[PDB]
């Protein structure tokens, strides 16, 4: 029946004398020590000892009851039949005391005389052993074994990666199963114990089956209610709504069930998780769960760990910390369960984190992690709190440790974003350091991490909150080598900024950079509009509160705008903007450097060289300005040691100025093809000069393997010093896809001309001529003409001689003064005459022969004039010799033209 219904109100103690002592078992003595003495001195029988002890238990005075039964035990040592009884009761009472005990007592414990759980457990073990030595196989002792083993098993700390606990659970199970066997399966506490063990073994369906069996066989067993077990089993197994049903039924039966209340609050808490953030539905569910069910349960027991932890979390959310400490502390002290301990430490950690006592916060996080077994298992949020706590204190190495450790465990979003940010910032810091370390690996790691974060924004299942900061960092990471991704990033940062045709005045820096990325692409007006938009945006900030260095941005951005105009073309406006920026701020030198270049192209003769000189003088140590001046000196050499001199003075200003080095390889190279070869010693001398050119080319290209100009200069070195066309051509092919300058194509055409690959040398040259700067470059037209001519020789192709003449005539049009160009049209005409004379009538036409004769006349004229001309390309007598053979070629062509049009009859 009901527990304690057994006890009567009053009883009479049979004294040695009589009638004697009567006792009220509802309102007992405040101390039983005397009564114990009475019973000792009365050799008192054993029912009285038990009746009074259990009486003390009914009004919660459990120790009294223990003490009584301790003395009763020793008083009846001769007889073991009820000794067995009281010793078993002792054991069970030691389990009770065990339950209300603490894991550990305060630091002034003292550790011996520890009132701890393990103290009562060990005491229960001994008493139990005493009773089993009397009668092993007394059913209540089979129960006792089970229970004990459970209570001891729960105290096993979390293992890493347990076998100790698992086996202990098995032992409990077998003891509970023995208690069942002995009862022939009618002991419901034994089967409840078995169910518990199964649940601890993760055998949930059998555990459920067991609690259900209890309810089925014995519904009125409600102390303890197995329906709790039912609910817990349902919840694991993933049926939290049926768990709800069970625990509501638990409460229906007993609304003051302190565990059913918590469990129901936990149901609603979980439910409040599945609904969003703060909402009407969320708030009702959360206040319901916490206030109703957890408070209710807390009023019933202030010392109930799960409740304590849960309500500590409640207060945490409401930033009310005196409560949080007390509760969470209480929970940690009084718990059989590690999970609870870890949750308590975690709550305290988050409190001390908020308030800022980081050392004890980090220790707390650590204890929270370890409670669940620490590393390789543990509490993910606790680990994270540690990582953050280590990030502060600036001990960023260890932060890197644990975050890595975590992402290796699982792709946790919060780890990924923090680690990636950490790496990004490492790279950014590096770049302004005294010595740039190599952090390309750390950069990659960052990029990958924040792209993994982008994946997190992508997948519908997560709730998908987006961060600016991540996008900006990622934009900067990509900036150096993968700029288009950086652009896209900044475009989506644009969108996020605007959300919170198109007129856009967002912060200036964002707009500028976007402008910059647009500018690296062709979109120079899009860029220009973005710069203008940035300026406007700075003006808007200027009027209002926020102080940014608006004067700095109003120096930088208008340069960018001038540069963009310049890119775009309305250079005059570029000029005026540079100038306006200069009027307000004339010491911003990059502006005037662009001005001087704008000038160098507009007025090559006059103001430009004036302007650059002035800029070199007024501003002689700016490496960009320098480069420009050197570029200017190169133009003067083309016009032809001022340039080499200067480049290595600059070389004393900076050892690794790639521009100047390739400037040297170039200068050497040019000066050294014209070096008198003579032969022998003289010939060697210049091959040393090429060596020096390659000296400079290689150092330059070793600093910057991406440098195409240095590599191409090595290909030129190749071709000229060691006629290695084949690989020099390799260099040329992949420099060609990166450079696009005319001279690249010219140099290519030169190689292909050598390699008999005429067609491909043709349209190399053709592409060169297409290109801005002169289409009509005489020297390229010449080279193209001869290439065509050699193609005509090779292939027996008239049309190729046709083209060679056409080209030779295009050149003559351009420079009609020029002696040789005239010789060339002439030579080619004589060749066409020749080849046409060699051909068979079967493959020839009479029209062709007329035009050839015409051309030949032209040729004789040109050659004849050249003979008379001073400074002839070849000796004049050799030119006359060519003309004299042109008299008998005249007749060859006469003859065969007659023969041909007769064939044409």
């Amino acid at each position: 029946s009901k527990r304690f219904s057994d006890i009567p109100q009053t009883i009479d103690i049979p004294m040695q004398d009589d009638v004697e002592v009567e006792i009220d078992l509802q309102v007992l003595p405040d101390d039983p020590t005397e009564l114990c003495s009475v019973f000792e001195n009365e050799q008192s029988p054993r029912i009285y000892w038990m009746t009074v002890a259990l009486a003390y238990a009914k009004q919660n005075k459990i120790d009294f009851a223990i003490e009584m039964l301790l003395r009763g035990a020793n008083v009846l040592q001769g007889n073991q039949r009820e000794k067995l009884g009281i010793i078993t009761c002792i054991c069970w009472l030691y389990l009770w005391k065990s339950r209300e005990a603490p894991r550990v007592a305060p630091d002034g414990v003292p550790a011996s005389e520890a009132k701890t759980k393990e103290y009562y457990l060990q005491l229960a073990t001994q008493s139990l052993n005493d009773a089993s030595r009397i009668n092993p196989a007394f059913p209540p002792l089979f129960l006792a074994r089970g229970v004990l083993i459970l209570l001891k098993a729960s105290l096993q700390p979390s293992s890493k990666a347990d076998s100790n606990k698992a086996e202990q659970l098995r032992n409990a199970l077998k003891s509970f199963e023995e208690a069942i066997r002995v009862s022939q399966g009618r002991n419901m506490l034994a089967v409840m114990g078995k169910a518990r063990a199964l649940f601890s073994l993760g055998r949930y369906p059998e555990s459920l089956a067991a609690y259900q069996d209890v309810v089925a066989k014995m519904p009125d067993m409600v102390d303890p209610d197995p329906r709790i077990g039912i609910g817990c089993c349902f919840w694991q197994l993933g049926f939290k709504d049926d768990a709800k049903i069970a625990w509501e039924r638990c409460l229906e039966i007993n609304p003051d069930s302190k565990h059913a209340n918590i469990l129901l609050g936990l149901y609603y808490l979980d439910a409040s998780g599945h609904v969003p953030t703060n909402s009407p539905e969320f708030i009702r569910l959360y206040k319901k769960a916490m206030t109703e069910y957890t408070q209710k349960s807390f009023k019933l027991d202030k010392n109930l760990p799960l409740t304590c932890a849960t309500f500590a979390g409640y207060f945490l959310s409401r930033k009310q910390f005196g409560n949080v400490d007390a509760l969470a502390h209480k929970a940690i002290q009084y718990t059989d369960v590690n999970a609870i301990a870890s949750d308590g430490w975690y709550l305290l950690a988050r409190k001390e984190h908020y308030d800022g006592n980081l050392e004890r916060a980090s220790d707390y996080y650590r204890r929270a992690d370890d409670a669940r077994g620490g590393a390789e298992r543990g509490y993910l949020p606790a680990k994270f709190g540690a990582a953050q706590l280590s990030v502060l204190k600036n001990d960023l190495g260890e932060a890197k440790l644990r975050l890595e450790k975590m992402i290796q465990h699982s792709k946790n979003y919060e780890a990924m974003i923090l680690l990636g940010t950490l790496y990004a910032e490492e790279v950014f810091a590096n770049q302004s350091a005294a010595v740039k370390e190599d952090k390309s690996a750390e950069a990659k790691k960052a990029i990958s991490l924040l792209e993994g974060v982008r994946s997190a924004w992508k997948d519908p299942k997560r709730n998908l909150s987006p961060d600016a900061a991540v996008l900006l960092n990622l934009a900067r990471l990509y900036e150096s080598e993968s700029p288009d991704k950086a652009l896209q990033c900044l475009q989506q940062v644009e969108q996020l900024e605007i959300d919170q045709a198109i007129r856009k005045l967002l912060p200036p820096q964002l707009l500028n950079n976007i402008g910059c990325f647009y500018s690296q692409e062709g979109k120079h007006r899009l860029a220009t509009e973005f710069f203008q938009a940035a300026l406007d945006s700075c003006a808007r900030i200027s009027q209002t509160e926020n102080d940014l260095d608006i004067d700095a941005l109003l120096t930088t951005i208008p340069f960018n705008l001038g540069r963009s105009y310049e890119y775009e073309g309305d250079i005059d406006k570029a000029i005026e903007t540079y100038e306006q920026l200069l009027s307000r701020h004339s010491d911003y030198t990059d502006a005037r450097t662009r001005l001087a270049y704008i000038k160098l192209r507009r007025n090559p003769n006059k103001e430009g060289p004036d302007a650059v000189a002035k800029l070199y003088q007024e501003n002689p140590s700016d490496l960009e300005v320098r480069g420009l001046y050197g570029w200017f000196l190169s133009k003067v050499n083309s016009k032809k040691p001022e340039q080499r001199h200067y480049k290595h003075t600059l070389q004393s200003y900076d050892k690794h100025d790639r521009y100047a080095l390739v400037g040297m390889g170039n200068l050497h190279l040019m000066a050294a093809r014209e070096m008198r070869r003579e032969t022998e010693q003289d010939r060697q001398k210049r091959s040393a000069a090429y060596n020096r050119a390659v000296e400079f080319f290689d150092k330059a290209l070793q600093l910057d393997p991406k440098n195409a100009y240095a590599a191409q200069g090595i290909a030129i070195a190749l071709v000229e010093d060691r006629k290695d066309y084949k690989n020099a051509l390799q260099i040329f092919i992949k420099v060609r896809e990166t450079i696009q300058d005319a001279h690249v194509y010219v140099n290519m055409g030169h190689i292909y001309a050598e390699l008999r690959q005429f067609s491909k040398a043709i349209e190399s040259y053709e592409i060169a001529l297409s290109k801005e700067g002169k289409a009509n470059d005489a020297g390229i037209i010449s080279c193209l003409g001869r290439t065509w001519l050699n193609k005509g020789r090779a292939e027996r192709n008239l049309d190729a001689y046709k083209m060679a003449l056409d080209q030779a005539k295009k050149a003559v049009a351009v420079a009609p003064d020029q002696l040789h160009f005239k010789f060339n049209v002439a030579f080619v005409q004589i060749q066409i005459a020749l080849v046409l004379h060699s051909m068979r009538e079967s493959e020839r036409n009479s029209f062709q022969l007329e035009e050839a004769a015409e051309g030949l006349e032209e040729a004789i004229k040109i050659l004849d004039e050249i003979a008379a001309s001073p400074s002839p390309p070849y000796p004049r007598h050799d030119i006359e010799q060519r003309a004299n053979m042109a008299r008998n070629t005249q007749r060859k062509q006469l003859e065969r033209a007659l023969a041909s049009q007769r064939e044409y009859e």
Binding site: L151, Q212, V215, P224, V337, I340, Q509, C516, T593, A808
Partner: protein, 107 residues
């Protein structure tokens, strides 16, 4: 003499571009780690909530088994903690709790 041919001086050039001096990137103000947002507890509060709840109150799981007070057990009889010979009719509110796991559907 007859070694005359098309005349086209043949030279290679590697002229450098003038320093472009492109536009200049500006530093976009951002929330660092030093700015507390990423190191604040708050940022972890979502991550903390989506963690599964522990529903294990005790070693005994909130159903504490003690025989203490149970009328005869320390003497011979487990009557108090023994199921009746005749199973009682099932209460309507226990019917849903008695449903076999199979009957429950899919998790």
């Amino acid at each position: 003499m007859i070694h005359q041919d098309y005349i086209a001086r043949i030279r290679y050039s590697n002229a450098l571009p003038p320093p472009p001096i492109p536009p200049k990137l500006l530093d976009i103000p951002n929330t660092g780690l030093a700015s507390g947002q990423y190191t604040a507890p708050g940022f972890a509060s979502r991550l903390a909530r989506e963690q599964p709840l522990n529903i294990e109150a005790d070693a005994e799981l909130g159903m504490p088994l003690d025989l203490v007070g149970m009328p005869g057990v320390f003497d011979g009889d487990e009557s108090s903690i023994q199921a009746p010979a005749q199973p009682p009719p099932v209460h309507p509110h226990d019917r849903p709790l008695l449903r076999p796991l199979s009957t429950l559907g899919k998790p």
